[PDB]
Amino acid sequence: RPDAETQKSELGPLMRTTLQRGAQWYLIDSRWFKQWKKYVGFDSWDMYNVGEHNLFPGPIDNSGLFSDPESQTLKEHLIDELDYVLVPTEAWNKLLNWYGCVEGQQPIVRKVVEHGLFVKHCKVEVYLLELKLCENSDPTNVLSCHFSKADTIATIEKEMRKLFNIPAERETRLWNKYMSNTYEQLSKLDNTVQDAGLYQGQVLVI
Amino acid sequence: ESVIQNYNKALQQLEKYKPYEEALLQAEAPRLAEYQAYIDFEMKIGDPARIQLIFERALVENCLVPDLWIRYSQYLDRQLKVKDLVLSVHNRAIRNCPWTVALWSRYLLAMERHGVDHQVISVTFEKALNAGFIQATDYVEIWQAYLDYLRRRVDFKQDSSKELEELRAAFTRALEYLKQEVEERFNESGDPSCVIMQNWARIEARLCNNMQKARELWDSIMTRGNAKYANMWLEYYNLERAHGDTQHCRKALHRAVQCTSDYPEHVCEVLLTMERTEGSLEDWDIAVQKTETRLARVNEQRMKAAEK
C-alpha cells in the first residue's frame, strides 16, 4: 500500500542478510519478483516504467512452482537465480501485507543449514532427497524418507527404529554402500549427515 | 629540401640494409629465420615505417606463423597505438592463424584498450568460441580473457550493478560451458585446478564482499579432487584470512591438515603458527594433538611403503 519508493527503500537492506543457521527463508517465483523489481525499479538500472500500473505485480502467485496444485508439493530441479528467488522473514511479512497472495496457498518456508563436504558453507536447504531405507531381513522392501542435513545420524537411527518395529533394548549397526563396491559401516552417532557425506536417495539399511 | 643529402642519406640506409637484403635472397623458401634477423635489426633502429614494412614483407611468405603475428600485433600495441591500424592487424592474425588463442585474447584486450563498443567486443568473443582450438587449456584462457574484460566493466563500489550481473551470468555460463562442451570434445575437464572458479571466488569475496558464495565455490573446487593439494587449501585459507573470520580459518586448517597429501607438514606449520599468533592455549593444544595424529599416520604410511 505505500509508495513505490517506500517499498524499494524498505527491501533494499534485504541483501545484507547473510544466510544463517536456524534461519527462516522462503520461496518466491522469480517471474513475479522480477515484475515487482521492475515495478519499484529496485534495480537502479531498470526504472523506466516506475510504478506505472501496467507493471503491477498484483497478488503473489507461485502456482507454477508446485507440482501438485492441491498438495502444494513443489517441482523438482528448481534452481535459485532462474526459477525462483529466496527471501528473508520480514521481507515476506512486508511483501505479504502489501500484495497478499493467491487464495489456497501457504508460504513456502525453508531454513538454511550448514553443508559442504570440505569447505563448510551456508545455503538454504531444499530438495532434500528421500533417502532410501531398508531392513536386513527384506532386501526388496525399501522406504524413502526425508532427512534434513542438520539431522544427525542418531535422529536417522531413531526414525529407522520406529518404522521397523524395533524397540530400544537391542543394539544396532548402520552401514553405507555408496559408490564404493565394498560395504562400509557407520560409526559415529553424534555427527550430522553432511560431515558423514551421505548421498541423496540411497539405501541406508538397518 | 636539399636533395642530394636526401639522396646521400637514403644511400647510406640502402648500404646499411644491403647485407640483410642479400642474405634473404640467398636463403630458403620461407627464409623465416632470415626474416627474424631482419626484424630484430629493424626493431633496434626503431623507425615505424620500416618496421611495418619488414613485418608485412615477412607475413607475405609466412602468414601461418602465429609467433610472427604476435610480435607484430604486440608491437603496434606497445609503440604505435593507432586504432585503425592495430585492430586491422589483429583481425588479420586471427584469419590466418585462428587455432591460436593468444591472437584472439590479444585481440580482445586491444579492442578494450581502444574503447571498442561492448557489443562488438562480445560478438568477437563468441566467434572465438566457435574457432577451433587444440587444448582444453586454450578454452579456459579465452574465457578468462573475456571474464576479466567483463570485470573491468564493473564498478565494484556499488552493491548491485548490472554489469556485475552480466559478469556473474558469464561466470555461470563459463563453468557449465567448460564442463559440458570442453569435456565432451576432449574427454577431460578443461579446468583441473578450477582456476575460473578460483577467480570467481576471489572476486566474489574481495570485491563484492560476498563471502558465502566464495565458500560454496571453494568447497566445489575441493570436491573436484583438489583437496589433496597443500597449496590449494592455503589459497582458500588466505582468502578467508582476508575477508572472513578466525573461526573459519581454524576449521579450514583443521580440514586442510586431514586432507593434504603432498606437503602436510607445510599446512601443519601454518596451522600451528596461526594458533600461536591468534589462538588461545586450548586452541593451540588441539592443534598440536591433531597435527601429531595426522603426522603420525603419514610417517607410518612412509614406513609401510618400506615394510611393503
Curated annotation (Swiss-Prot), chain A:
- Spell out the family assignment given in the record's similarity comment: Belongs to the peptidase C19 family. USP4 subfamily.
Instruction: Give the region (Necessary for interaction with SART3) as residue ranges.
Output: 18-206
State how changing residue 42 to D affects the protein, per the record: Moderate reduction in thiol-dependent deubiquitinase activity
**Species the sequence originates in:** Homo sapiens
For this chain the motif Nuclear export signal maps to 124-132
What is the UniProt domain comment for this protein?
Answer: The DUSP and ubiquitin-like 1 domains promote ubiquitin release and thus enhance USB4 catalytic activity. However, these domains do not bind ubiquitin.
- Outline the extent of the DUSP domain: 2-113
Q: Mutating residue 127 to A leads to what result? A: Severe reduction in thiol-dependent deubiquitinase activity
The record's account of tissue expression is: Overexpressed in small cell tumors and adenocarcinomas of the lung compared to wild-type lung (at protein level). Expressed in the hippocampal neurons.
The record describes its quaternary structure and partners as: Interacts with RB1 (both dephosphorylated and hypophosphorylated forms). Interacts with RBL1 and RBL2. Interacts with ADORA2A (via cytoplasmic C-terminus); the interaction is direct. Interacts with SART3; recruits USP4 to its substrate PRPF3.
Q: How the protein is affected by changing residue 31 to E?
A: Moderate reduction in thiol-dependent deubiquitinase activity
- Report the function annotation for this chain: Deubiquitinating enzyme that removes conjugated ubiquitin from target proteins. Deubiquitinates PDPK1. Deubiquitinates TRIM21. Deubiquitinates receptor ADORA2A which increases the amount of functional receptor at the cell surface. Deubiquitinates HAS2. Deubiquitinates RHEB in response to EGF signaling, promoting mTORC1 signaling. May regulate mRNA splicing through deubiquitination of the U4 spliceosomal protein PRPF3. This may prevent its recognition by the U5 component PRPF8 thereby destabilizing interactions within the U4/U6.U5 snRNP.
Kindly provide the PTM information from the record: Monoubiquitinated by TRIM21. Ubiquitination does not lead to its proteasomal degradation. Autodeubiquitinated.
Q: What is this protein called?
A: Ubiquitin carboxyl-terminal hydrolase 4
Q: What is the effect of changing residue 15 to D?
A: Moderate reduction in thiol-dependent deubiquitinase activity
Superkingdom, according to UniProt?
Answer: Eukaryota
Give the UniProt subcellular location, in the record's own words: Cytoplasm; Nucleus
- Where do the Ubiquitin-like domain residues begin and end? 133-206
From Swiss-Prot, chain B:
Where does the record say this protein resides?
Nucleus, Nucleoplasm; Nucleus, Cajal body; Nucleus speckle; Cytoplasm
Its primary localisation, in coarse terms, equals nucleus
Tell me one GO biological process term.
homeostasis of number of cells
HAT repeat feature ranges: 46-78, 81-113, 116-152, 209-242
Recorded GO MF terms: histone binding; protein-macromolecule adaptor activity; RNA binding; U4 snRNA binding; U6 snRNA binding; U6atac snRNA binding; ubiquitin-specific protease binding
GO cellular component assignments: ASAP complex; Cajal body; cytoplasm; nuclear speck; nucleoplasm; nucleus
The keyword Ribonucleoprotein is assigned to this record: no
What superkingdom does the record give? Eukaryota
Subunit: Component of the 7SK snRNP complex at least composed of P-TEFb (composed of CDK9 and CCNT1/cyclin-T1), HEXIM1, HEXIM2, BCDIN3, SART3 proteins and 7SK and U6 snRNAs. Interacts with AGO1 and AGO2. Interacts with PRPF3 and USP4; the interaction with PRPF3 is direct and recruits USP4 to its substrate PRPF3. Interacts with USP15; the interaction is direct. Interacts with HIV-1 Tat.
Protein name (Swiss-Prot/TrEMBL): Spliceosome associated factor 3, U4/U6 recycling protein
Instruction: Tell me what organism the protein belongs to.
Output: Homo sapiens
Q: Which residues of the full protein are shown?
A: 279 to 586 of 963
